[PDB]
Amino acid sequence: ASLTEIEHLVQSVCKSYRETCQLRLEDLLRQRSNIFSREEVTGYQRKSMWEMWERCAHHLTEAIQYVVEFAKRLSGFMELCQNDQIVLLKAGAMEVVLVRMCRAYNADNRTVFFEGKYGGMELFRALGCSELISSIFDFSHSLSALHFSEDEIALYTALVLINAHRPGLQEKRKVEQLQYNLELAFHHHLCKTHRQSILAKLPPKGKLRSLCSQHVERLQIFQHLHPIVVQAAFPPLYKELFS
Amino acid sequence: KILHRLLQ
Ligand SMILES: CC1(C)CCC[C@](C)([C@H]2CC[C@]3(C)[C@@H]2[C@H](O)C[C@@H]2[C@@]4(C)CC[C@@H](O)C(C)(C)[C@@H]4[C@@H](O)C[C@]23C)O1
């Protein structure tokens, strides 16, 4: 509720993000030419479905952990009640990951960083869910067309997380105050850096809900054909969030 | 269980 309070919110969010982003951008850019060879890709396509789901679920969980830590350092988050902190994270941890991951996607060759190197979606054929994979690559693609800055990613991912429309929130208005302050910080920064054109091009709020949904739907199909593998080999946190 | 623990 003041121009410098807002300029200052921007820096703290940007700062929170740099401290919690898991992979440094430089490194992800270095590695772009470290591409998987055809033999390696075959190696992956010939791993069993369940070995491959388990690997993907561990990576996702590593990534989600950084998202929690981002939440904790977020100005305002910890001052909410523990019901709403949980609600917000259950809903949006993954959505945030869906945005973060575009730093690791290369639009020139349609690849994504995974286990050391870059690969295309044919890398993940063993999972048996190519509609989900290609929705994720198409999402990453469409974000890469906005050429985000890190500051822009910080501010926007803070807004994804801090959504006052989530069902289950008890202290709903305290989330609106926090949201609104972050709406402002973000919009101010785009105004300062001449980037308000990107607003019209951002994904519909629908789109992140949809991909989160496909994920849950394919999970259930998998779980139903491999109940014990989920029970015995899937990270607890993954199961907390997605079962 | 898990998320509560990470938050405290
Ligand atoms: C949902 C399941 C478990 C099942 C279907 C396939 C997916 C979507 C697979 C396909 C691509 C996948 C490895 C994804 C993982 O979650 C998380 C990762 C990651 C976000 C997780 C780790 C991140 O540091 C990084 C490199 C950005 C990954 C992405 O570069 C690729 C991604 C997004 O996982």
A18 Cβ neighbours under 8 A, 6+ residues apart: A150, A154
Looking at the structure of chain A, the number of domains it has is 1
Which of chain A's residues have a Cβ under 8 Å away from the Cβ of B3?
68, 86, 89-90, 237, 240-241
DSSP 8-state class, residue B7? H
B7 in A contact zone (CB under 8 Å): yes
Residue A236: domain span: 1-243
DSSP, residue by residue, chain A: --HHHHHHHHHHHHHHHHTT-SS-HHHHHHGGG-BPPHHHHHHHHTS-HHHHHHHHHHHHHHHHHHHHHHHHTSTTGGGS-HHHHHHHHHHHHHHHHHHHGGGGEETTTTEEEETTEEE-GGGGGGGS-HHHHHHHHHHHHHHHTT---HHHHHHHHHHHH--TT-TT-SSHHHHHHHHHHHHHHHHHHHHHTT-THHHHTSPPHHHHHHHHHHHHHHHHHHHHH-HHHHHHHS-HHHHHHH-
B4 in A contact zone (CB under 8 Å): yes
Resolution for this experimental structure (Å): 2.8
Tokens representing A216 are: 């849950």
Q: How far is the C-alpha of A178 from the C-alpha of A33, rounded, in Å?
A: 41
Cβ(A132)–Cβ(A58) below 8 Å: no
| Residue position matching structure tokens 């938050």 | B7
Question: Residue B3: helix, strand or coil by DSSP?
Answer: helix
Q: How far is the C-alpha of A237 from the C-alpha of A98, rounded, in Å?
A: 17
Which of chain A's residues have a Cβ under 8 Å away from the Cβ of B5?
none
Angstrom CA distances, A65 to A20, A29, A97, A243, stand at 9, 23, 10, 17
A6 Cβ neighbours under 8 A, 6+ residues apart: A181, A184, A185, A188
Q: Is the CB of A230 under 6 A from ligand 1?
A: no
DSSP, residue by residue, A163-219: -TT-TT-SSHHHHHHHHHHHHHHHHHHHHHTT-THHHHTSPPHHHHHHHHHHHHHHH
Q: How far is the C-alpha of A77 from the C-alpha of A175, rounded, in Å?
A: 9
Q: Phi and psi for A46 in degrees, rounded to 5?
A: -105, -5
Are A65 and B6 inside 8 Å of each other by CB? yes
A16 Cβ neighbours under 8 A, 6+ residues apart: A70, A73, A74, A75, A154, A158
